[PDB]
Amino acid sequence: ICGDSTECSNLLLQYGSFCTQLNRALTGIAVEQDKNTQEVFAQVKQIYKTPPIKDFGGFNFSQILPDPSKPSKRSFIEDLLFNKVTLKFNGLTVLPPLLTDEMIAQYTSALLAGTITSGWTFGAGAALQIPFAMQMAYRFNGIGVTQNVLYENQKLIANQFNSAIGKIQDSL
Amino acid sequence: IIAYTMSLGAENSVAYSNNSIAIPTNFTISVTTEILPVSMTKTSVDCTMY
Amino acid sequence: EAEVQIDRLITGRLQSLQTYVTQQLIRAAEIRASANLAAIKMSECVLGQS
Amino acid sequence: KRVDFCGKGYHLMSFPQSAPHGVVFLHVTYVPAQEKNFTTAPAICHDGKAHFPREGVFVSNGTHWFVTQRNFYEPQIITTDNTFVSGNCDVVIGIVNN
Ligand SMILES: *[C@@H]1O[C@H](CO)[C@@H](O[C@@H]2O[C@H](CO)[C@@H](O)[C@H](O)[C@H]2NC(C)=O)[C@H](O)[C@H]1NC(C)=O
Ligand SMILES: *[C@@H]1O[C@H](CO)[C@@H](O[C@@H]2O[C@H](CO)[C@@H](O)[C@H](O)[C@H]2NC(C)=O)[C@H](O)[C@H]1NC(C)=O
Ligand SMILES: *[C@@H]1O[C@H](CO)[C@@H](O[C@@H]2O[C@H](CO)[C@@H](O)[C@H](O)[C@H]2NC(C)=O)[C@H](O)[C@H]1NC(C)=O
Ligand SMILES: *[C@@H]1O[C@H](CO)[C@@H](O[C@@H]2O[C@H](CO)[C@@H](O)[C@H](O)[C@H]2NC(C)=O)[C@H](O)[C@H]1NC(C)=O
Ligand SMILES: *[C@@H]1O[C@H](CO)[C@@H](O[C@@H]2O[C@H](CO)[C@@H](O)[C@H](O)[C@H]2NC(C)=O)[C@H](O)[C@H]1NC(C)=O
C-alpha cells in the first residue's frame, strides 16, 4: 500500500496495527498447512522396504510400487497424476513446503510396502511378516465369506485384480 | 548450531517370505493421553461506551 | 491537498487487502476440514479393514 | 473397533478428566511384543480331504504342526473339531501332508 514512499509510510503509521495482525493470520495459516500435511502422511515410525524378490500369490503391484528408473522414485500412477494437473512482484512471497515431494513419496512407499507384507499388524506395534495369500483369506473372513472360498479361486481373483488395476491405468 | 537434512526415521527391511509368519508371545499395556479444547471465554462488548 | 488523495488510496487498498485475507481464512478452514477427513480415512482404511 | 481412533493399538477402555477449557482422555491399549519365527501353510491334507482352521492359523516349530490363535502364541494339537473340511486337496496352492 505504499510502494516505498516515505510520506505514505508516515500517513499509514497513524492507522494503528492492522498489518501486524494481518501478517499474524497469514503466518498462522502457513504453519497450519505444514501441520496438516505432516498429520495426514506421517503415520509410520519406520521406513519399511519391499523384498527384492516378489511372489505375492499371483497379484501384480508393478504399477504402484516405486520405480528405481526415475530419479524421483515415483511409481507409474504417481507419474501420470503428476503429469495430469497443470497450474515476487510487489510484496507477494511464496514459501516452499517443509516436506519435499521425495519425502512424500517415501512415506507412501513405506505405507504400501508395509501393508503388502505385514498386513495391519504394523499399525498397532511391530510389523509381522505374513504371506499375502494367507492375508486375503483373513480379509474375506471379516466380511462373512468363509476363507474356503479364497483358496479355491485364487487364480481367478488374481486375474480380476490385475484387470481392474490395468483398467484404472487406462482410464487415468 | 547445526543445520541438517530431515530424517524420516529408521529403516528396516521386513523379511517377507511365502511360508513364514511371526506370532507374538507376550504383551504390554499402555496408557496414553489426548487433550481436546471444548470451550472458550464468553465476551460481551458495549458499543456506545467503547 | 495531496494528503487527501493519498488517504483515499490508502483506505481503498487496505480494504481490498482485508477482504483477501478473510477469503483466505475461510478457504483454509474448509481445506483443514477436508484434510482431517482424509487423515481419518487413511488411518481407518489403509491400516485396517473397515 | 475403528483402528487408531482412540489409542495407538488395540483399544480396551478410557477415562475422562477435566481441564480448564477442555477434556483429557486416558486411553488404555493392548500392545503385543516378543515375536518369533514360524513356518506356515494354508491347509492340511488328510485322507485326500483338505482341512482348514475354524479360528486360528497353522504353525510348526520344525517338526510338529499346531493351530494357534492369531494374536497370542498358544499351540494346540490339531483335532477334527477346530478344523473344517471342504473338498479334496488338488487345487489349493500350499497344502502340506499331515
Ligand atoms: C505386471 O504387469 C505388467 C504390465 O504393466 C508387466 O509388465 C509387462 O511385462 C511384459 C513381459 O515381461 C512386457 O512385454 C511388457 O512390456 C510389460 N509392460 C510394461 C508396461 O512394461 C509385468 O511383467 C507384470 N508382472 C509380472 C511379475 O509379470
Ligand atoms: C526370522 O528369520 C529371518 C530370516 O533369517 C530373520 O531375518 C534376518 O535376521 C538376521 C538376524 O541375525 C539379520 O541379520 C538379517 O538381515 C535378517 N534378514 C532380512 C532379510 O532382513 C528374522 O530376524 C527372524 N525373526 C526373528 C524374530 O528372529
Ligand atoms: C512378559 O513380559 C513381562 C514384563 O514385560 C515379564 O514379566 C517379568 O518377568 C521377569 C522375570 O520373571 C521379572 O523379573 C519381572 O519383574 C517381570 N515383570 C513384571 C512387571 O512383573 C514376563 O515374564 C514376560 N512373559 C514371559 C512368558 O516371559
Ligand atoms: C517342537 O515342539 C514339539 C512339541 O513340544 C517338540 O516335541 C516334543 O519334544 C519334547 C522334548 O523337548 C518331547 O518330550 C515330546 O515328547 C515331544 N512331543 C510333544 C508332542 O511334545 C519338538 O521337539 C519341537 N521341535 C523343536 C525343533 O523345537
Ligand atoms: C514359496 O516360494 C518358493 C520359492 O520359489 C517355492 O519353491 C518352488 O517350488 C516349485 C514347486 O512348484 C519348484 O519348482 C521351485 O524350484 C521352488 N523354488 C525354489 C527356489 O526351490 C514354493 O513352492 C512357494 N510355496 C508356496 C506355498 O507357494
Ligand SMILES: *[C@@H]1O[C@H](CO)[C@@H](O[C@@H]2O[C@H](CO)[C@@H](O)[C@H](O)[C@H]2NC(C)=O)[C@H](O)[C@H]1NC(C)=O
Ligand atoms: C503327500 O501325500 C500324497 C499321497 O500320500 C503324495 O502323493 C503321491 O506322491 C508320490 C510321489 O510323488 C506319487 O508316486 C503318488 O502317485 C502320489 N499319489 C497321489 C494320490 O497323488 C504326495 O507326494 C505327498 N506330498 C505332498 C507334498 O503332497
